[PDB]
């Protein structure tokens, strides 16, 4: 939201699902299904974890639309 410590809170929630699924996997091709999704979600989250634009020093773009006649 606005606090960068929220990253740890939203990280632990996904890590819990990851560890839970590592144990619970469908029996159909279980030994590869249990390992695929856990990586399909890893960066899936990590690259989102860095999208946070907060704590930004650089200036923000001047406005161009909203003509304001």
């Amino acid at each position: 939201m606005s606090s960068f410590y929220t990253v740890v809170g939203v990280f632990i929630v996904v890590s819990a699902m990851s560890v839970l699924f590592w144990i619970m996997a469908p029996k159909n091709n279980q030994a590869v299904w249990r390992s695929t999704v856990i990586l399909t979600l890893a960066m899936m989250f990590l690259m989102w974890a860095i999208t946070f634009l907060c704590q930004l020093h650089p200036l923000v773009a001047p406005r161009r639309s909203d003509l304001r006649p």
Partner: protein, 148 residues
């Protein structure tokens, strides 16, 4: 590329995951990804008879990896989602909050302070002048290195 020696780990899962995510992060236009996935869905649903019908010269490899383009696109749409680009457009899904005066005439640099950006993706505020581009490029050239 080459076979591995005896009892040498094969990079099956790395191929399943990384290469599609790489291709997705290559480009993420919503329309382009959706359109590309349209052909993938058509091919996979018609595979009932395509599997048996003759594969054209240009269609041999295409039919070979019909299930790959699906992953390509399903990751491309997400990768572009954080970029908030649909043919260079954005509906301002979330709200971030930005400061502007009561009135302003263009041609002047206008500063807007941050009180919290989009929880997911980047805010629409970077749709302005070259300042937005020269911030976005610096932002993006770092995450690539980190992820690599």
């Amino acid at each position: 590329y080459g076979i591995a020696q005896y009892r040498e780990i094969n990079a099956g899962l790395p191929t399943i995951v990384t290469f599609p995510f790489m291709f997705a992060i290559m480009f993420g236009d919503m329309g382009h990804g959706f359109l590309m996935t349209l052909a993938a869905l058509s091919l996979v649903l018609n595979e009932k008879k395509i599997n048996k019908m003759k594969r054209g010269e240009i269609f041999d490899m295409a039919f070979t990896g019909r299930y790959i383009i699906l992953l390509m696109g399903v990751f491309s749409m997400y990768t572009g989602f954080l970029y908030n680009d649909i043919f260079s457009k954005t509906m301002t899904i979330f709200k971030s909050g930005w400061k502007w005066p009561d009135h302003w005439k263009k041609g002047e640099s206008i500063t807007a302070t941050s009180v919290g950006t989009y929880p997911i993706g980047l805010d629409w505020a970077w749709h302005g002048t070259e300042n937005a581009l020269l911030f976005s490029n610096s932002y993006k050239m770092k995450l690539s290195i980190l992820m690599g």
